[PDB]
Design a protein around this motif. Structure first.
Motif, PDB file in Angstrom:
ATOM      1  N   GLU A   1       0.821  -1.205   0.000  1.00  0.00           N
ATOM      2  CA  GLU A   1       0.000   0.000   0.000  1.00  0.00           C
ATOM      3  C   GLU A   1       0.858   1.258   0.000  1.00  0.00           C
ATOM      4  O   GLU A   1       0.560   2.218  -0.717  1.00  0.00           O
ATOM      5  CB  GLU A   1      -0.937  -0.012   1.206  1.00  0.00           C
ATOM      6  N   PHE A   2       1.922   1.280   0.805  1.00  0.00           N
ATOM      7  CA  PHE A   2       2.811   2.438   0.807  1.00  0.00           C
ATOM      8  C   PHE A   2       3.424   2.659  -0.569  1.00  0.00           C
ATOM      9  O   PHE A   2       3.462   3.791  -1.071  1.00  0.00           O
ATOM     10  CB  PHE A   2       3.909   2.258   1.855  1.00  0.00           C
ATOM     11  N   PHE A   3       3.906   1.585  -1.194  1.00  0.00           N
ATOM     12  CA  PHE A   3       4.525   1.707  -2.504  1.00  0.00           C
ATOM     13  C   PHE A   3       3.536   2.247  -3.524  1.00  0.00           C
ATOM     14  O   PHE A   3       3.858   3.157  -4.294  1.00  0.00           O
ATOM     15  CB  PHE A   3       5.064   0.353  -2.962  1.00  0.00           C
ATOM     16  N   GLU A   4       2.322   1.689  -3.556  1.00  0.00           N
ATOM     17  CA  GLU A   4       1.362   2.128  -4.562  1.00  0.00           C
ATOM     18  C   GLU A   4       0.896   3.557  -4.296  1.00  0.00           C
ATOM     19  O   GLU A   4       0.677   4.325  -5.239  1.00  0.00           O
ATOM     20  CB  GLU A   4       0.181   1.156  -4.638  1.00  0.00           C
ATOM     21  N   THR A   5       0.758   3.945  -3.023  1.00  0.00           N
ATOM     22  CA  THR A   5       0.408   5.330  -2.715  1.00  0.00           C
ATOM     23  C   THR A   5       1.489   6.291  -3.186  1.00  0.00           C
ATOM     24  O   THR A   5       1.190   7.324  -3.796  1.00  0.00           O
ATOM     25  CB  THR A   5       0.179   5.502  -1.212  1.00  0.00           C
ATOM     26  N   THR A   6       2.754   5.975  -2.908  1.00  0.00           N
ATOM     27  CA  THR A   6       3.834   6.845  -3.361  1.00  0.00           C
ATOM     28  C   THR A   6       3.894   6.886  -4.884  1.00  0.00           C
ATOM     29  O   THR A   6       4.146   7.944  -5.477  1.00  0.00           O
ATOM     30  CB  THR A   6       5.166   6.374  -2.779  1.00  0.00           C
ATOM     31  N   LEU A   7       3.659   5.746  -5.533  1.00  0.00           N
ATOM     32  CA  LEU A   7       3.645   5.721  -6.988  1.00  0.00           C
ATOM     33  C   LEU A   7       2.552   6.626  -7.537  1.00  0.00           C
ATOM     34  O   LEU A   7       2.786   7.393  -8.477  1.00  0.00           O
ATOM     35  CB  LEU A   7       3.462   4.283  -7.475  1.00  0.00           C
ATOM     36  N   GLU A   8       1.353   6.566  -6.954  1.00  0.00           N
ATOM     37  CA  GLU A   8       0.286   7.467  -7.375  1.00  0.00           C
ATOM     38  C   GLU A   8       0.675   8.919  -7.133  1.00  0.00           C
ATOM     39  O   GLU A   8       0.360   9.798  -7.945  1.00  0.00           O
ATOM     40  CB  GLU A   8      -1.011   7.129  -6.642  1.00  0.00           C
ATOM     41  N   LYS A   9       1.356   9.190  -6.019  1.00  0.00           N
ATOM     42  CA  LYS A   9       1.831  10.544  -5.756  1.00  0.00           C
ATOM     43  C   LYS A   9       2.752  11.028  -6.866  1.00  0.00           C
ATOM     44  O   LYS A   9       2.693  12.195  -7.270  1.00  0.00           O
ATOM     45  CB  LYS A   9       2.557  10.586  -4.411  1.00  0.00           C
ATOM     46  N   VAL A  10       3.614  10.142  -7.370  1.00  0.00           N
ATOM     47  CA  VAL A  10       4.672  10.532  -8.300  1.00  0.00           C
ATOM     48  C   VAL A  10       4.262  10.411  -9.766  1.00  0.00           C
ATOM     49  O   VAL A  10       4.988  10.908 -10.638  1.00  0.00           O
ATOM     50  CB  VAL A  10       5.948   9.709  -8.036  1.00  0.00           C
ATOM     51  N   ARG A  11       3.128   9.780 -10.070  1.00  0.00           N
ATOM     52  CA  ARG A  11       2.763   9.581 -11.466  1.00  0.00           C
ATOM     53  C   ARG A  11       2.495  10.917 -12.159  1.00  0.00           C
ATOM     54  O   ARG A  11       2.036  11.871 -11.527  1.00  0.00           O
ATOM     55  CB  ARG A  11       1.532   8.689 -11.595  1.00  0.00           C
ATOM     56  N   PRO A  12       2.776  11.012 -13.459  1.00  0.00           N
ATOM     57  CA  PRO A  12       2.520  12.268 -14.169  1.00  0.00           C
ATOM     58  C   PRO A  12       1.061  12.406 -14.571  1.00  0.00           C
ATOM     59  O   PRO A  12       0.285  11.449 -14.528  1.00  0.00           O
ATOM     60  CB  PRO A  12       3.413  12.161 -15.412  1.00  0.00           C
ATOM     61  N   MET A  13       0.706  13.617 -14.996  1.00  0.00           N
ATOM     62  CA  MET A  13      -0.599  13.922 -15.569  1.00  0.00           C
ATOM     63  C   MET A  13      -0.535  14.193 -17.067  1.00  0.00           C
ATOM     64  O   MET A  13      -1.262  13.563 -17.841  1.00  0.00           O
ATOM     65  CB  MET A  13      -1.211  15.141 -14.863  1.00  0.00           C
TER      66      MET A  13
ATOM     67  N   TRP B   1      11.694   7.571 -12.775  1.00  0.00           N
ATOM     68  CA  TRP B   1      12.071   8.733 -11.990  1.00  0.00           C
ATOM     69  C   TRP B   1      12.453   8.347 -10.571  1.00  0.00           C
ATOM     70  O   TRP B   1      13.470   8.816 -10.046  1.00  0.00           O
ATOM     71  CB  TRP B   1      10.920   9.727 -11.993  1.00  0.00           C
ATOM     72  N   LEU B   2      11.658   7.487  -9.931  1.00  0.00           N
ATOM     73  CA  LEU B   2      12.010   7.041  -8.588  1.00  0.00           C
ATOM     74  C   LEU B   2      13.397   6.410  -8.569  1.00  0.00           C
ATOM     75  O   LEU B   2      14.241   6.762  -7.736  1.00  0.00           O
ATOM     76  CB  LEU B   2      10.970   6.056  -8.056  1.00  0.00           C
ATOM     77  N   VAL B   3      13.655   5.476  -9.489  1.00  0.00           N
ATOM     78  CA  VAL B   3      14.921   4.747  -9.455  1.00  0.00           C
ATOM     79  C   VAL B   3      16.091   5.680  -9.743  1.00  0.00           C
ATOM     80  O   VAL B   3      17.142   5.592  -9.100  1.00  0.00           O
ATOM     81  CB  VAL B   3      14.888   3.558 -10.432  1.00  0.00           C
TER      82      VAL B   3
ATOM     83  N   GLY C   1      10.997  15.671  -3.471  1.00  0.00           N
ATOM     84  CA  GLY C   1      12.003  14.775  -4.008  1.00  0.00           C
ATOM     85  C   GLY C   1      12.320  15.128  -5.441  1.00  0.00           C
ATOM     86  O   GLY C   1      11.701  16.016  -6.033  1.00  0.00           O
ATOM     87  N   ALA C   2      13.311  14.426  -5.996  1.00  0.00           N
ATOM     88  CA  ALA C   2      13.704  14.679  -7.380  1.00  0.00           C
ATOM     89  C   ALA C   2      12.636  14.201  -8.357  1.00  0.00           C
ATOM     90  O   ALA C   2      12.366  14.858  -9.369  1.00  0.00           O
ATOM     91  CB  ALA C   2      15.043  14.007  -7.675  1.00  0.00           C
ATOM     92  N   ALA C   3      12.024  13.048  -8.079  1.00  0.00           N
ATOM     93  CA  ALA C   3      10.907  12.602  -8.901  1.00  0.00           C
ATOM     94  C   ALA C   3       9.729  13.557  -8.787  1.00  0.00           C
ATOM     95  O   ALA C   3       9.063  13.843  -9.790  1.00  0.00           O
ATOM     96  CB  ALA C   3      10.493  11.188  -8.502  1.00  0.00           C
ATOM     97  N   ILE C   4       9.462  14.060  -7.582  1.00  0.00           N
ATOM     98  CA  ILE C   4       8.418  15.064  -7.414  1.00  0.00           C
ATOM     99  C   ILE C   4       8.750  16.306  -8.227  1.00  0.00           C
ATOM    100  O   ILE C   4       7.866  16.933  -8.819  1.00  0.00           O
ATOM    101  CB  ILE C   4       8.225  15.402  -5.925  1.00  0.00           C
TER     102      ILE C   4
END
Ligand SMILES: [Mg+2]
Ligand SMILES: [Mg+2]
Ligand SMILES: [Mg+2]
Ligand SMILES: [Mg+2]
Ligand SMILES: [Mg+2]
Ligand SMILES: [Mg+2]
Ligand SMILES: [Mg+2]
Ligand SMILES: [Mg+2]
Ligand SMILES: [Mg+2]
Ligand SMILES: [Mg+2]
Ligand SMILES: [Mg+2]
Ligand SMILES: [Mg+2]
Ligand SMILES: [Mg+2]
Ligand SMILES: [Mg+2]
Lengths: 151, 100, 82, 115, 102, 126, 100
Positions: A59-71, A102-104, A131-134
């Motif tokens: 859940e943490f991983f998928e939440t952070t991924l949703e946070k970082v995904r582009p629009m 971006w995360l990696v 963060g840098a991905a952010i």
RNA sequence: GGGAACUUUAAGGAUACUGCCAGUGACAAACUGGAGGAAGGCGGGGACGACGUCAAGUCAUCAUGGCCCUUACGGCCAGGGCUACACACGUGCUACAAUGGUCGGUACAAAGGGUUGCUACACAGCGAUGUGAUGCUAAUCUCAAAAAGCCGAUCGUAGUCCGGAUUGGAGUCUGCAACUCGACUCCAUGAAGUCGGAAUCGCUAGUAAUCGCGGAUCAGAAUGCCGCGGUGAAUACGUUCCCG
């Protein structure tokens, strides 16, 4: 290509968490076919992040991924000898792929001793919102927003 | 190659054939432990005193048909130039093109 | 390096010339083409001319040179700078 | 500690630390520590005066810095003075063991010299 | 731009020729500068050891920063004539390509 | 009692299946001993957790050739075929899983003039 | 207790199979029992030969030659069987070794 | 002792043909979605090079027209050279480390080579190796240790317990002979290098990246060439601008 429609390959779910998303993330981390070291890195990072706060790692991983995904992104269009960066929507697969890359990359450019530690730090930073991905997400939004005018 | 090259190769082979027996006996004496040290030294001196062409190390493989010193291919005894021709004429038994 | 068990290598003709020279007392140089021979301890005090490809260069053999080959004192190339 | 006139690192295993003296490598350090009785993983800061004296006594038996440097220089200058082929290569600062000087001889000739 | 000029056995080459070719070629094509990174000229004599009106072949091939490498050939009776013809043809070709791509 | 053969990347596995408590042996060795890598164990175990009847069977396995991944794939293929032989009604679900299929991917040979099967030397245009 | 071991080597598998079939038929006519033919691993020998006279390294011909081996045993043989085997003729291209 | 089941070995056969169902198109070719099957619409690779182009390459594999030398432009020999070194290019190998280095334990291949050779095993040596000795003309004996990998310990961001160029001593082996000019082993030394300008290359799947193993040439001398297997990815919206 100019023809055909290549189908997507299937990534088996990870052993511990049985997550295809986590398996794809491990594939992004992997180098030179060293998938065992890839899993070691990813699982060490996940344990490290779980230590900070008691939540489901998936859940943490998928939440952070949703946070970082582009629009929104632009694709350069060459007409009249000009760049003409035209904003456009992107498919979910591309969204996920750019988020993971971006995360990696941000983790790789961080400055901790080990890849697991710096990947965990990047996940925490993305969860917080700095963060840098952010920053790359912010930049892509900013540029596609500057160029919203064109279709 | 030139006929002089071929004749030099032939004379070298003849000398090696002539002196093989003495060369082998001297090497055996050199490698014999029970033999005396002075005998071993004398064997070494005789082996060093043998003619140079008696040494097989001075022989170079040649095509045989043409005498070319490159691409020899021990098994057939022919350099690549003539080996290809003979093979693709059908005169070499068992040899075919490879596709795997 | 040549294996010790075989021992040092010296050409027969050079060896015989050296023994003749040492048995007698003559400082006339010993002309030779055997750059591959070893300077034996009995070579000291003798002048030996060694072929270097187009001419014979003299070498007065002293205690330091023992163990080197003859050709090590007769360079074969002529380079003076670019 | 100071062994053979040089201060070796302190926060290090003894085997690694001893290799900071000229003329001692990991093999020689292992030999020295075996002779003394010190465990290799032991750090240098944990050694007392007696162990330091033992290590110095062992190290004195091998040529380390001045004895080794002067010996090497004497051999090289002997070659240069006598004038053998190796001596001439030493004099001209070119590969001594038979490598190609047409290309890739930058560890002896140094940075490339423009014409 | 780095210059790499080569000849054949018939033509005969020297470092003097290298210096002269480099100087002349740079002088002619100095305008483009950064647009172009590499030149390679090649010289041959075709029917070596005989003669004719042309009897010598010059080539020049240049790499422009960006677009793909472009080549030019010329035949002439003398090395200087071959070089001049090749230079003129290169100039025309590069002008045409740059006008096309704008 | 029921036999199956599995094949994957030069590896071949012989699988014997008979109703039992849940034993699982590979070359006189246990799964954890033979496979120190978790993905291989998961692959070996998929077919029988798929039918939810893992511990109602006993397996005797031998394998030869290939590496760890190929051997794991071969063992899984053998288990699947043994199940199909044991019962006909298992085949549709096993095929829906995809275990009935035999993977035909293999290493491509090196080729003349190329460094590898597909990779070729450098052609610089600097 | 006597057993005869038969080993066939060839460059043509069709020829070697014909030879082995003829041997087993000959044994059957005599009335002895024979095990085989048993195929044995084939040897492959592959060679790369340049096809251009002077300079083209990538333009080559790849040739191969194969050695085929077949094994036969005949057990409980009789005096007539052995004489029949010796009397049997041999065709070219198939080297046959008989071991008692 | 046995068995002929399974793996394998190596000859001969079967299978896959849009064969069948639902759609599309002129009711044509043909194209989509399905069932079954190990495999489904050329399944994946390899050989196979149209008429023709560039007086393209090769008189130094070889043959051949025409010119040239004939006590030398022919023949034999010993040394030296092809390995030179103010520099400039092309193709590679190894690294700049922690997704890692070192140490101890511990699993899993495929293809080839071996009688002028490969050599089990004991001893001697730190080691390259040497001596004795054993089985092999080989699905039988042998090269042979697979390595990345997994488990445990240390290293804790340092030009370092990263890197291994260069140089100084001491050796083994092949060979008539390792000076110019060999491969390898041990001790000591420890260089540049901390990720590389403009530019530019390869690659769409068991592919790229990475890890080890074999062979032809060959007394000895591969980072080259030709093969083999282990782990194993990323991404294709689309043809608008780039070229052929
Ligand atoms: Mg001739
Ligand atoms: Mg030879
Ligand atoms: Mg030495
Ligand atoms: Mg021409
Ligand atoms: Mg591979
Ligand atoms: Mg293959
Ligand atoms: Mg065709
Ligand atoms: Mg020409
Ligand atoms: Mg010529
Ligand atoms: Mg000569
Ligand atoms: Mg050369
Ligand atoms: Mg190191
Ligand atoms: Mg530096
Ligand atoms: Mg060899």
């Amino acid at each position: 290509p100019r023809r055909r429609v290549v189908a997507a390959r299937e990534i088996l779910p990870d052993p511990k968490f049985s997550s295809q998303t986590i398996a794809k993330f491990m594939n992004h981390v992997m180098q030179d076919g060293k998938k065992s070291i890839a899993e070691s890195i990813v699982y060490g990072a996940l344990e490290r992040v779980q230590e900070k706060n008691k939540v489901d790692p998936v859940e943490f991983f998928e939440t952070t991924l949703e946070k970082v995904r582009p629009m929104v992104e632009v694709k350069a269009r060459r007409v009249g000898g000009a760049t003409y960066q035209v904003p456009m929507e992107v498919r979910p697969s591309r969204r996920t792929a750019l988020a993971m890359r971006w995360l990696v990359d941000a983790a790789a450019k961080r400055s901790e001793k080990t890849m697991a530690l710096r990947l965990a730090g990047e996940l925490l930073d993305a969860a917080e919102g700095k963060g840098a991905a952010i920053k790359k997400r912010e930049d892509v939004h900013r540029m596609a927003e500057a160029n919203k005018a064109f279709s | 190659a030139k006929k002089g090259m071929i004749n030099r190769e032939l004379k070298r082979e003849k000398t090696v054939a002539k002196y093989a027996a003495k060369r082998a006996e001297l090497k055996a004496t050199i490698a014999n432990v029970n033999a005396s040290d002075e005998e071993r030294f004398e064997a070494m001196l005789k082996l060093q005193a043998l003619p140079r062409n008696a040494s097989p190390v001075r022989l170079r493989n040649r095509c045989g048909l043409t005498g070319r010193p490159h691409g020899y291919f021990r098994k057939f005894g022919l350099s690549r130039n003539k080996l290809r021709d003979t093979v693709m004429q059908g005169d070499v038994p068992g040899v075919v093109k490879a596709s795997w | 390096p040549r294996s010790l068990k075989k021992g040092p290598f010296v050409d027969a003709h050079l060896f015989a010339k050296v023994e003749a020279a040492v048995a007698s007392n003559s400082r006339k140089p010993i002309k030779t083409w055997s750059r591959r021979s070893m300077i034996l301890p009995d070579f000291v005090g003798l002048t030996i001319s060694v072929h270097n490809g187009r001419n014979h260069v003299p070498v007065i053999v002293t205690e330091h040179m023992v163990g080197h080959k003859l050709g090590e004192f007769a360079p074969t190339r002529t380079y003076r700078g670019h | 500690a100071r062994i053979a006139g040089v201060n070796i690192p302190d926060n290090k295993h003894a085997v690694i630390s001893l290799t900071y003296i000229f003329g001692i490598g990991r093999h020689t350090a292992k030999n020295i520590l075996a002779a003394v009785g010190i465990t290799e993983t032991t750090k240098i800061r944990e050694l007392d005066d007696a162990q330091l004296d033992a290590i110095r006594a062992e190290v004195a038996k091998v040529p380390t810095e001045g004895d080794l440097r002067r010996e090497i220089s004497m051999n090289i200058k002997r070659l240069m003075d006598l004038g053998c082929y190796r001596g001439l290569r030493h004099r001209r600062s070119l590969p001594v063991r038979g490598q190609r000087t047409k290309t890739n001889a930058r560890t002896r000739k140094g940075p490339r010299k423009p014409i | 731009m780095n210059i790499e000029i080569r000849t054949d056995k018939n033509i005969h080459n020297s470092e003097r020729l290298i210096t002269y070719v480099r100087a002349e070629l740079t002088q002619e094509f100095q305008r483009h500068s950064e647009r172009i990174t590499h030149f390679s000229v090649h010289f041959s004599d075709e029917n070596g050891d005989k003669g004719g009106d042309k009897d010598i072949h010059c080539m020049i091939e240049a790499r422009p920063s960006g677009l793909k490498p472009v080549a030019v050939h010329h035949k002439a009776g003398n090395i200087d004539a071959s070089i001049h013809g090749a230079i003129e043809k290169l100039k025309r070709s590069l002008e045409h390509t740059f006008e096309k791509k704008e | 009692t029921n036999y199956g053969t599995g094949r994957r990347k030069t590896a071949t596995a012989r699988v014997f299946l008979s109703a039992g408590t849940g034993k699982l042996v590979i070359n006189n060795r246990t799964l954890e001993q033979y496979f120190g890598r978790e993905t291989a164990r998961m692959v070996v175990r998929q077919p029988l957790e798929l039918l939810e009847a893992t511990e109602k069977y006993d397996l005797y396995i031998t394998v030869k050739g290939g590496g760890i991944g190929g051997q794991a794939g071969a063992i899984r293929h053998g288990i699947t075929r043994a199940l199909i032989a044991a019962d006909e009604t298992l085949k549709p679900v096993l095929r829906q899983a995809g275990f009935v299929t035999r993977d035909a991917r293999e290493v491509e040979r090196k080729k003349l003039g190329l460094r590898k099967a597909r990779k070729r030397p450098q052609f610089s245009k600097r | 207790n006597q057993r005869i071991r038969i080993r066939l080597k060839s460059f043509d598998h069709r020829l070697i199979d014909q030879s082995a079939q003829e041997i087993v038929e000959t044994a059957k006519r005599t009335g002895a029992q024979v095990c085989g033919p048993i195929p044995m691993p084939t040897r492959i020998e592959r060679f790369n030969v340049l096809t251009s006279p002077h300079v083209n390294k990538d333009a080559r011909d790849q040739y191969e030659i194969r050695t085929y081996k077949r094994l036969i045993d005949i057990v409980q043989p009789t005096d007539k069987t052995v004489d029949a085997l010796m009397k049997l003729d041999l065709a070219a291209g198939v080297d046959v070794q008989i071991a008692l």
